[PDB]
Design a protein around this ligand. Structure first.
Ligand code: A1BLH
Ligand code: A1BLH
Ligand code: A1BLH
Ligand code: A1BLH
Ligand code: FE
Ligand code: FE
Ligand code: FE
Ligand code: FE
Ligand code: FE
Lengths: 125, 125, 125, 125
């Protein structure tokens, strides 16, 4: 199995109250759904990503990332967010991320297409 | 089909000489391989991502993102990059992105875990 | 007198244990020193920046930013960090930032020149 | 004098048509004005920043950064941009930057407070 396949798989919550449900595959795949508590979003959206399935054994975290395009059967916000971060295991497991949210824009507005932020996910709350 | 399924699917090159080979699915999926011309990387890596399969019809671009974890059969750089951006169609089609590259780190180096940059992909190298 | 001139001026600490000493001028200037608890840094470095001296009155925060170039009489890390963020007043006043740390690099390494992160500053600890 | 004091001082233009007028001081100071061709901006705004006044001699660029708060006598966009980057000298001198644009927001919208982008400045056009 991947080293943190079991630790990453499951339900995660971030500081905004969003819910990140993910399955880690033994080869590096991430698949799941994301539900945002904020923004132009309702219900669940497909996500897909990748993770390092053989991380360093020196106490380092486990690099990973995933993408949501904000289109589902309810809404289309013409945008996509990618989260890039690392998983840290243990009693208070965390996924610490930074993210890039790009909107489809006209060429005149493309300088302002992308927001950046940071989300921390925990297995509780 | 996704509105830009045909325009996104194929081989792309960025300004560093990296090669991004992608298939866009009608529902929003992106799958393919990435080969970086720079960094701790050799040969192809799996990528997965998502795109807006029903973008605005007002001349706006098409939001999308994808992830590579930098582990393959040759190397493991204990890191993952996510690209977030928009596809702009037409005779000089482009995918304009910004990206976040996170390494697995110890908690002491985690403040320095993530680089940020920008890549532009075209259909011609 | 800037609206938050009095609230911003003083000593601030972030989650890494770094110390940010700043004076806010009535026109929008920020001047002070920064001492980082981490990285290739020792003792204090000059900082300068700007803040919105007439913020919105609707409960919004106060936008601001500043720069440190990591050269002083002790060390030169050939890099500079800019923090961009907002000040939020009140009993638990905070400056919430994201930052970009760029190193001087060769053109071959320039794709990897810049790290991104987030710091939260408070008046205590 | 700073090593690139003479090369940095002067008028610069980015890809959007904005105009950056700056004086570099021998100790590391940057002072000047910024005029944006885009966004909620009119005429010139104060800027201040810092640069590495003793960069590496191995052909590396020169790290620097600066801030604009988007308030002047004409408009107040309740926001600030910081540019972080490096100066590269020579016949086609360039300042290559990434930037963070933070607006003052309510706490409910703070997740969306910050845009990120990249500007390249040249001495011509
Ligand atoms: O909303 C969506 C889809 C849902 C995304 C959820 C994000 S994903 C990272 C995170 N993690 C989570 O769990 N949830 C959030 N797309 C469109 C975004 C357009 C950006 C528009 N505005 C923000 C804004 C919000 C409210 C009122 C006004 N303006 C950008 C902006 C930036 C700076 C200054 C001003 N405005
Ligand atoms: O290399 C990889 C896997 C490949 C990624 C390729 C990227 S993906 C975005 C892009 N698009 C492309 O096509 N290719 C590139 N991971 C490890 C990254 C560790 C970062 C270490 N150093 C950079 C460095 C380079 C050379 C010598 C020394 N240090 C970070 C850093 C930040 C600032 C200052 C100094 N160092
Ligand atoms: O250190 C300085 C001056 C001090 C800055 C302090 C920052 S300012 C934002 C913050 N807030 C604070 O208060 N303090 C910190 N410049 C040089 C930066 C070189 C980056 C090299 N490496 C990081 C690293 C650390 C340890 C061992 C190896 N490599 C980049 C990198 C990126 C990703 C993956 C790997 N490496
Ligand atoms: O404008 C200013 C002051 C001037 C700044 C100039 C920047 S400084 C980096 C650069 N370099 C330059 O030279 N010029 C630009 N502040 C307020 C920003 C509010 C953001 C609102 N919007 C963008 C937007 C524009 C038009 C219509 C709609 N939305 C954010 C957004 C983001 C993502 C998706 C959707 N909306
Ligand atoms: Fe907007
Ligand atoms: Fe490093
Ligand atoms: Fe490095
Ligand atoms: Fe907005
Ligand atoms: Fe908006």
């Amino acid at each position: 199995m991947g080293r943190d396949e079991a630790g990453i798989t499951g339900t995660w919550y971030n500081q905004l109250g969003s819910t990140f449900i993910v399955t880690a595959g033994a080869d590096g795949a991430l698949t799941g759904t994301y539900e945002s508590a904020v923004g132009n979003a309702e219900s669940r959206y497909v996500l897909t990503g990748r993770y390092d399935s053989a991380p360093a054994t020196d106490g380092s975290g486990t690099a990973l990332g995933w993408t949501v395009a904000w289109k589902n059967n309810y809404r289309n916000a013409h945008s996509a967010t990618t989260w890039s971060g690392q998983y840290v295991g243990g009693a208070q497991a965390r996924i610490n991320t930074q993210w890039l949210l790009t909107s489809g824009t006209t060429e005149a507005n493309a300088w302002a297409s992308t927001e950046v932020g940071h989300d921390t996910f925990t297995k509780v709350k």
